[PDB]
């Protein structure tokens, strides 16, 4: 079996909690990056680069512009498995 979703979700959160600009106690799974956490586009680009390393594949820019919350990253990540 390749991946769990409870498990790719632990990794998205792991990574976000590593990111210095996110404050760990505001970071929920559905918190918007810009609206709640107060990031900007350039910061979000850094987040998807960190995701690219963590799961070892390339996310195209078109698809990365969409991912505005952790939950949304999980679902896109999940597309490879079931």
């Amino acid at each position: 079996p390749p991946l769990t979703l409870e498990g790719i979700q632990d990794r998205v959160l792991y990574v976000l909690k590593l990111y210095d600009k996110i404050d760990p106690e505001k970071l929920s799974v559905n918190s918007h990056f810009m609206k709640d956490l107060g990031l900007d586009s350039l910061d979000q680009v850094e987040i998807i680069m960190a995701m690219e390393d963590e799961f070892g594949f390339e996310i195209p820019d078109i698809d990365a512009e969409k991912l505005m919350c952790p939950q949304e990253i999980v679902d896109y990540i999940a597309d490879k498995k079931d």
Binding site: D40, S41, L42, V45, P60, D61, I62, E65
Partner: protein, 421 residues
């Protein structure tokens, strides 16, 4: 005569529409564009695939470096420097000002900026230093990466020994060059200023850098990629070019029997001071800048009839500018025209503000408004006259007054107020 009047007497254009004042204007009015597909092996990795290049060659309206700079100079100077010298030669020829007397040379200054250094020269020299040693670095290396080298060469070549002022404000360089020149002439420091901007930094590395910042169209179709005010706008398209304006004190121009295009009335600047990336969605900064220009010019919002908008086909950018226009002009917003020429030329970075000053100037001389290209479809929020698709005549019987806006990264805003005589 503490605050004189200032007019524009000369325009020099090297753009992706081609070269020369008449020609570039005609193609602009006719709805032409210089946006093309990227045609390189090294461009495939990057999600941008379009840009606007100056056409090179010896046909009419094509840029021929040889007509402006010697074969030795081409090697020692960057692409943007050469374009600036060319645009300046054309601008002064268009002005008829060739100062030979000492009095005229000290009364003539230069203000030509470059928005960005060409990254490729830095990277190639860096690699050459790493692998071939110290003795392989060119001595022309540092001169080729300095921002004021354009102004330097113009100053030497045409004997301009008045105020020298290179400004580098990234996307607002050209606007600052013209506004500051206006102020210097109005203040008494110079009688003539040769002012504008240049940028030629289309390369894999810079497109990569801008793509990474989410700045550029990913749209593959060169015809559609740049569409200010349109619903599917997805980033700007990088262009290259230079534009130079000869500014001149009114009485000085009259006495020498110069052809005057337009009068510079005002200059305004502000900063958003919110976030470095996004504009203020309400456009409070753009509003304040425009208002400051109007105050400088001693004009009420109801006298403005045209606006060359900074709109670069960005979602948040075009919406902010639009909001600012509506809040400042109120009911008079529906009486004026607004157009972005960026669909034709692309975003010329450092030169953007000088080329659009040129276009607003010519819009004054003739009463002809260049179209916003590709604007086939429009959202309800954008309900003004954006001169969609086709140019419009604008024969007000009253005096024709335009604004041209330049917004840059960091939240810096600039506005020039330009008027038919």
């Amino acid at each position: 005569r503490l605050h004189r009047r200032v007019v524009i007497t000369g325009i020099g254009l090297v753009t992706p529409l081609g070269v020369g004042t008449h020609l570039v204007w005609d193609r602009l009015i006719g709805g032409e564009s210089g946006i093309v597909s990227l045609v390189g092996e090294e461009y495939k990795s990057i999600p941008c695939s379009v840009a606007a290049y100056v056409p090179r060659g010896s046909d009419e309206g094509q840029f021929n470096e040889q007509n402006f700079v010697s074969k030795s100079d081409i090697k020692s100077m960057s692409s943007p420097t050469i374009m600036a010298i060319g645009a300046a030669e054309l601008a002064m020829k268009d002005s008829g000002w060739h100062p030979q007397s000492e009095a005229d040379q000290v009364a003539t200054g230069v203000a030509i900026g470059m928005g960005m250094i060409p990254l490729e020269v830095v990277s190639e020299t860096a690699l050459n230093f790493q692998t071939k040693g110290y003795n392989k670095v060119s001595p022309f290396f540092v001169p080729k990466i300095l921002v004021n080298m354009a102004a330097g060469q113009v100053s030497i070549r045409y004997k301009l020994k008045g105020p020298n002022h290179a400004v580098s404000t990234a996307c607002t360089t050209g606007a600052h060059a013209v506004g500051d020149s206006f102020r210097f002439i109005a203040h008494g420091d110079a009688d003539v200023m040769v002012a504008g901007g240049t940028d030629s930094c289309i390369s894999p590395l810079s497109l990569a850098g801008f793509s990474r910042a989410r700045a550029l169209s990913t749209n593959s179709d060169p015809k559609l990629a740049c569409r200010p005010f349109h619903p599917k706008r997805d980033g700007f398209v990088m262009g290259e070019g230079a534009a130079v304006l000869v500014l001149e004190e009114y009485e000085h121009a009259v006495q020498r029997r110069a052809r005057i295009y337009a009068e510079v009335l005002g200059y305004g600047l502000s900063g958003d001071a919110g976030h470095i990336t996004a504009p203020d969605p309400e456009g409070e900064g753009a509003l304040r800048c425009m208002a400051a220009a109007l105050k400088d010019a001693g004009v009420q919002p109801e006298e403005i009839s045209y606006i060359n908008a900074h709109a670069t086909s960005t979602p948040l950018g075009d919406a902010a500018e639009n909001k600012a226009i509506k809040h400042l002009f109120k009911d008079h917003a529906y009486a004026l025209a607004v157009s972005s020429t960026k669909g034709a030329t692309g975003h010329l970075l450092g030169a953007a503000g000088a080329v659009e000053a040129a276009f607003t100037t010519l819009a004054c001389y003739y009463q002809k408004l260049p179209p916003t290209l590709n604007l086939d479809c429009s959202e309800p929020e954008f309900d003004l006259n954006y001169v969609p698709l086709k140019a419009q005549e604008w024969k007000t019987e009253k005096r024709f007054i335009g604004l041209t806006n330049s917004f840059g990264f960091g939240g810096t805003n600039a506005t020039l107020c330009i008027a038919g005589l």
